[PDB]
Each structure stands twice: as C-alpha cells, then as structure tokens.
Write a protein that binds this ligand. Structure first.
Ligand SMILES: Nc1ncnc2c1ncn2[C@@H]1O[C@H](COP(=O)(O)OP(=O)(O)CP(=O)(O)O)[C@@H](O)[C@H]1O
Ligand SMILES: Nc1ncnc2c1ncn2[C@@H]1O[C@H](COP(=O)(O)OP(=O)(O)CP(=O)(O)O)[C@@H](O)[C@H]1O
Lengths: 439, 439
C-alpha cells in the first residue's frame, strides 16, 4: 500500500499531512526550498530533499524536481496539499505517468472541474443546482445575448471559463467584448459565459469524500463568508440557518455528482447561498485550509481519509454514521499588519499558543522561527469547538486573548473585531460584510 | 447567581478554572503567593490579590487570607481546585459560614468521605462494593482479630481511618498494635480497621456529578494504574476491559451513593479493580487532575458543570445523553529529572507545545516562565483523543515527539518509554507495573 509519501507542500498543511502520515505509520519525505530548511515538518520528516531556491516557481512549483524526489526516495505517493500544484492537472498527470499515486483526483477530473463551463455542465447533468446562466459560452450575436441576459435578469456577470458585472443592456455588448478580449490575451482562452449576479450571497461549501470502492459521502458544510478581497479570514461549521433536511438534499446531490464524474479523494463544492437557495460556483478538487472545522463537528480525520483512499481503501465510515454535533470556528492567523494587510515577515521572538478544552492549534510556527517573505502569510489556524455556536465564539475570543506572537505583526486584532461584532454574533452575514465593516 | 469567583489555587488548574469562568461570563479573582505573580492565569484574571509569601502554608493554605480575598472583592464563590484546601472540611465550613458558595460538596460530606471507616460504611449502605474487611474498627482482642483476618483471608492490610500489610497470623497482633500506635501519634486518631490486601489490582475510578435538583450522573471511568510511588503518571478513559454493561452497573451505584449521602458537585469514586470485581477505596470530593480524559470521551465540560451546580443550576444533560465515544490519554508533564525524579525548577527558555487534530494541551507554562521550587512539579497535561485506544496512543507519541521544553529537565522520556511498552499497548497493566518496569 502507501509506505512512503512525498509531502509536496510547506507550512502548516505540510505539518498536518506529516502528522496524519506518522499516525498511519507512513514514512515521510519533506521536499523543501532553501528558505524552508527550518520548517517544523522538515525537522520532523524521515527524509528531506531540497527541491530548489526560495521562489515558489523554482521550488514548490518545480514539477520535475518534485517527481525526481519521489523517484530517488522510492516513494509511493505524493500529497500536494492545497495551493501550489494541487489543482494542476499537468502535475497530477505527470505524477501518475511516472508511477506514483497522486493523492487527489485523476488529472482528467481536475481539468474537468478546472474549466467553469465544463464544470457547470457536469454539475447540471448531475443534478447540482447552478447559477441561472447562458449554460454554455456566449455568442457574438448581441441580439441573442440581450435575449439571454434578459431571460436571466440583470444584473448579470460575464465570466471567462476575469469577471465583469453588467447592470443594464446599455453596456452588454462592450462588456462581453472586453472580458472576451482580455481573457483571451491573459490565458489563450477567449471563452466566456454569462450568469446571474447574486448581490447578497453567503459562501456555503459542502465537504465530500469519494473512494475507489464507489462510495461517496458528504460531511455537512462550512460558511466561509467572512472574507476580505476574496481571501477567507474566518470559517465555521455548520452553516447557520442550514437544517438537516436541506443538508441532506444538497449534500446527497454533491455525493452523486462525485460518482457521476468519477471523483476520488477529498473535495469541496462551493456555493453561493442566497434567499434559501444554493448555486454552484466551483469545485475545489483538493483538501482545503478550513477542513478542520468540519473535522471538529463530524469526528472525521479528513487527511487520514485522503491517505486511505489513495492507498485504495474504502472510506472508513458510512453516510449514516455522520451526524453534525456542535459547532466549530477557525481563525486564520496571518503575519501581516492588521490594518494595511501588508505582510509582516521576521523572527517570532516569542510564541505563546492557547489551549484547554475545545481549542485546537494547527501551526508550524515556533519561538525562534523566522517567517519568510517568499510565500503566503498564514502562520497558524486557531480552531475552536463548542456545543453551540455561542460557545465556539466565546472560546475563540478567550483563546485569541491568550495568544502571543511577539516580533511580528498579526491579524489577531482583526479576528477580535470580527468575533465581537453583533451581526457576526447573530450569524449569517454575507460575503460583503467584512469589507463593508472595514470601510 | 455566580458573578465573581475566587480561584483558590494555582498553576494549570487555576488556568483551567479561569477559562471556564471566562466562557460563562464570570468575573475572576486570582489569589496568589508572592512567587506566583507571573502565573499565566494571574496575568489573565480580572482582579488579583496577594495572599502571602511563597510557602504553601503561608499562602494557598492560608484560610483567613483566602476568605478575606473573597470579602474584599465582593466575590460570590470560591473554587478550591484540587490539592491544597479542596478537601479541607474546616475550609469549606468557614467559606459557607462566611456567606460564600464553596464550589464543592458541603463540609459535612467532605468530613464523611474524609474518614475511611465512615466513608466505607456509607458506601456499603448505598450498595457500592467495598473491599472485604472488618467493617468497622478492629478490637484489641487478638482472638476476635485472628478470626476476622481468617474470614477475610491473608494477606490483609491494617489501615488507619499509615498502612501495614500482614501475610500471616504470626504477625497480626503486633501489626495491629503498631499501626494503631503510630497512627495515633501522627494524627490523634488511633482508629484502624483491616481489609483484604489486593495484590494484583488496577486503579479504576468513576466520575460523577450531582446537583441541587436531586440529579446525579456517572461519566464512565478512568484507568489510572500507571503510577510511581502512588503518584499518577498516565491516565486513560475509558478503562480497557470495561463493558458498557459493567459501566452502567457500577456507575449507577455511584450515582445512587451521591444522592444517599447528599453529594453536590463533581466527585470521583476510586476503586481497586481485580479479577473483574470493583472494590471501593476512596471518594475524592473535588475535581481531579485527570478530568480531561473524561471530557474527551463524553463531551462534558466538567469544570463548567461545577460552576453551574454551585450557582444552583441542574446538570446540563441527562444520563441517557452520555455515551462513551473513542478513547483518551493524558500524560502528566513534570519538571523533574526523568531518572531520579528530583524536581527541576528554573527558567523555561523555550517552549514548543504540540497541536493538531485530537491534541489538547492544558498548561500554564510559557516561554520565559520560571518554574518555582515551592510547589508541585507539574507543568503541563498533554491529552490526546482518538477513535480507538491505539490511535490515542500513537497521537500521544507523536505529540510528545513534537514537544520541546528547554532549560529544565522533564519526564517526557518516561512517558515515551511507557507509551512504547508492549504491555501498556496491550492494556490493562496493574498498579505495580511502572515500578516493576523501572526496576
Ligand atoms: N454569479 C456570481 N454572483 C456574485 N458573485 C460571484 C458570482 N460568481 C462568482 N462570484 C464571486 O467572485 C468569486 C470568483 O473568484 P474566482 O473564480 O476568480 O477565483 P477564487 O479563488 O476567488 C474562488 P475559489 O475559492 O473557488 O478559487 C467568487 O468567490 C464569488 O465570491
Ligand atoms: N486493600 C488494599 N489492597 C491493596 N492496595 C491497597 C489497598 N488499599 C489501599 N491500597 C493502596 O494504597 C493506596 C492508599 O493511599 P492513601 O490512602 O495513603 O492515600 P493516596 O493519596 O495515595 C490514595 P488517593 O488518590 O485516594 O488520595 C491506594 O491508592 C492503593 O493503591
């Protein structure tokens, strides 16, 4: 089965994967850039290989170097984590062709859901609800396009398979002409469609697992609406307002979609959720940053399941075994200025991480560690669990109050502002809320 | 109700109590000695009061100073934690007479279970199984005593209401004479009884809660057999080998005992468990160090329940709501030499605490903190949870491997030795095992 895994990532998720591997007795190979020799998981790994200099392009995105690392160590499998190459179908393809197991879906499935028109087509076919839209690429005939846009109803948004919002017919012809011409020079792909622009939605996403035994399960949902410039700040599970009846409906549709498309591994169906209706926007064909809140409310170890699935085993439980219990919250702690959001690299002179009942800390940072400039700014994920949403929130507030990260700036002050916001405490704020509140 | 609580303790348990208070919106008063100004919970408390110089006798055992702290701050209640004054009936009595709520049982109940002959009498009356014994204090008539000892069956142990084991009648007369004469000069109490000496037992203990609404519940059990010189090192829950049928039997008997004796708050019934039978040895009438493993397998917040009960509320759930799920382990991390077990006070130059899924860390220690000489040596409790005992163990091993405490010695190496022991991995080793293994 899986005896040795290359962890083709860094930071916190690399450590999360290492922990899962070690629990399963799987040997680890940490591939790393020159700037990441001091990463906690590298220091804990069974074997280490330097795959390039600091810049991501030369290291964590270096496909030949990563595959060569699997070859020399006689590894069986490669775990891409999230970001980097995790949704690069060329990578997945090269990994399998080279005789290693890619811990993720097949390349064909990555490419399928990597294209928005084809992803949407497959979801429609599978019975997953989608944003009303052109359903297919848009013509050049502006007459047909004004007809379609009128059908859908303004405002619409033009999107390449990057986006442009149109609130009247007055503007439709140019808007389609530009998004098409600017999306064709950016990525030799002039294909664009239109769909309804939802002005007041939440971000609600369904976690799935699918195995090579033909099983697929849903693991409730997460609300990730608390965002700034499309970057998630706080996530929670379950999503406030979502009943078990609604959960079973949408969840079961996502599970069926997995089987229809030949899905394998962990994945997430993202929806815009508005006026009680779900509308599909994307499938992330990988583990995600915010997976821990789902773990806390379902009792599933999502990274362990990824490894078991990749080894050819069935998912370790059945749908009927999963029941949402309690509530969980996650704050993404970033090394950045809490007001300008400019990164804040440098030496963590002192770290004090919080603890106690219902507090989980997923972080590679340690006292004496230097946060490098070269990658993203996430340094920790603080996760709380409680019997109710109110308890999870209070526990997060207290845990943040205990957290000390000296020597660099963090966004802890932003989390504190969010957690004490009366609207957030009520729950169900939309994806625009944080930017509105920040001014 | 409870608006303000004096935390009449220190170290990790003081922090645990502070966290519960803050979650409930209860104001905190940290009473502390001069040596504990730098304790994490003191730094987080709403109000602080110095109750004396470093030595415990002059501070944490200073009854007038602690009560005076409650008086001046206009506190409502005092939480004694464990150790110190938590099972001092004189303290409980003075706290209630002074108009404060003692977060614990009534003084009369403390004194009742604080005496072994009367504790045993009450348990017998309540239907809790006890070690076969004289049932009452022993005569002076050695004839009657040889009759009783013969009934019970050697080896017996003489115990003052400290202990002396007798393996033949040859020795019985003196043995009873001495334990009686050495227990009367030590604590003006010459009262001694005899009971069966169990040579091969495990330490299995049942957690209860009882409220002022007449409810009492049991929360499964813990195995605390891994001990050195009667000091617990590793605890787990549930106890290996214990079926749900057996759990309900013994558990329900403990719950009834609570109601029969007028119990209030959290408590623990300790048993020696041998050849499939339970034998009562003591009731701890307080929260215990190892409470977290029970929290992890039942989903109950035991310190929050203590506070709710003390405020006059019912226990927040019913017996039928509790079901054991998974398995949990706790390692007591002490600042001590891992071989000589001599304390190791001094400055923690660097702390790195472990994390991830299923890892809980309950500790007041932080980088830069100096562990003082004046109190016990416990610096942290590392707690893991898993679906199975095997997973909890592997997770504990990995978490220990990640743990760094620089500047002082710890017993982490002892925990590592224990966790990889094949007999411990099988489970069910007796209370003598660790001393035997250590030689
Ligand atoms: N029909 C619609 N109506 C309103 N907002 C929409 C929309 N379609 C997309 N959006 C918003 O624009 C975002 C699209 O982002 P984009 O497709 O460029 O990559 P992304 O990374 O931000 C989303 P993902 O997390 O799936 O990668 C969505 O997250 C959504 O918030
Ligand atoms: N009948 C018996 N047979 C065998 N061992 C016994 C016994 N009675 C007591 N013991 C052992 O001697 C110990 C008694 O310890 P003692 O009563 O002096 O205070 P203690 O603090 O060690 C127990 P506790 O944790 O309840 O305070 C028990 O823990 C038990 O291991």
């Amino acid at each position: 089965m899986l005896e040795k895994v290359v962890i083709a990532n860094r930071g916190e998720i690399a450590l999360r994967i290492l922990r899962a591997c070690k629990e399963l007795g799987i040997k680890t190979v940490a591939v790393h850039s020159t700037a990441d020799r001091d990463l906690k998981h590298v220091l804990l790994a069974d074997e280490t290989i330097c795959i390039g200099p600091a810049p991501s392009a030369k290291s964590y995105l270096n496909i030949p170097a990563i595959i060569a690392a699997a070859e020399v160590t006689g590894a069986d499998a490669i775990h891409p984590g999230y970001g980097f190459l995790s949704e690069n179908a060329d990578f997945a393809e090269q990994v399998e062709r080279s005789g290693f197991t890619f811990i993720g879906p097949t390349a064909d499935v990555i490419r399928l859901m990597g294209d928005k028109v084809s992803a949407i087509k497959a979801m429609k076919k599978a019975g997953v609800p989608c944003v009303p839209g052109s359903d297919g690429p848009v013509s050049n005939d502006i007459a047909k396009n004004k007809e379609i846009a009128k059908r859908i109803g303004y405002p619409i948004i033009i999107k390449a398979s990057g986006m442009r919002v149109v609130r009247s017919e007055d503007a439709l012809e140019e808007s389609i002409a530009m998004t098409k011409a600017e999306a064709k020079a950016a990525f030799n792909n002039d294909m664009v469609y239109m769909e309804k622009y939802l002005e007041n939605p939440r971000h609600v996403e369904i976690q799935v697992l699918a195995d090579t035994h033909g099983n697929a399960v849903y693991l409730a949902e997460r609300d990730c609406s608390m965002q700034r410039r499309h970057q998630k700040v706080v996530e929670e599970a379950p999503a406030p307002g979502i009943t078990e009846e609604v959960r079973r409906d949408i969840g079961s549709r996502c599970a069926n979609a997995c089987v229809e498309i030949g899905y394998r591994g962990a994945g997430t169906f993202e929806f815009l959720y508005e006026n009680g209706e779900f509308y599909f926007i994307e499938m992330n064909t990988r583990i995600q940053v915010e997976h821990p809140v789902t773990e806390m409310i379902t009792g599933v170890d999502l990274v362990k399941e990824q490894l078991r699935i990749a080894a050819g085993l069935p998912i370790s439980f059945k749908q009927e075994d999963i029941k949402v219990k309690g509530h969980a919250m996650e704050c993404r702690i970033n090394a950045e200025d809490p007001k300008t959001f400019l990164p804040s690299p440098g030496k963590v002179n002192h770290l004090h991480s919080p603890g106690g009942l219902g507090v989980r800390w997923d972080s590679h940072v340690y006292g004496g560690y230097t946060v490098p400039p070269h990658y993203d700014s996430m340094i920790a994920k603080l996760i709380t669990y409680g019997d109710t949403r109110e308890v999870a929130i209070r526990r997060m507030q207290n845990a943040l109050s205990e957290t000390i990260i000296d020597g660099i700036k963090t966004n802890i002050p932003l989390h504190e502002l969010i957690l004490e916001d009366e609207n957030f405490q009520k729950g169900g704020t939309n994806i625009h809320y944080l930017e509105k509140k920040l001014g």
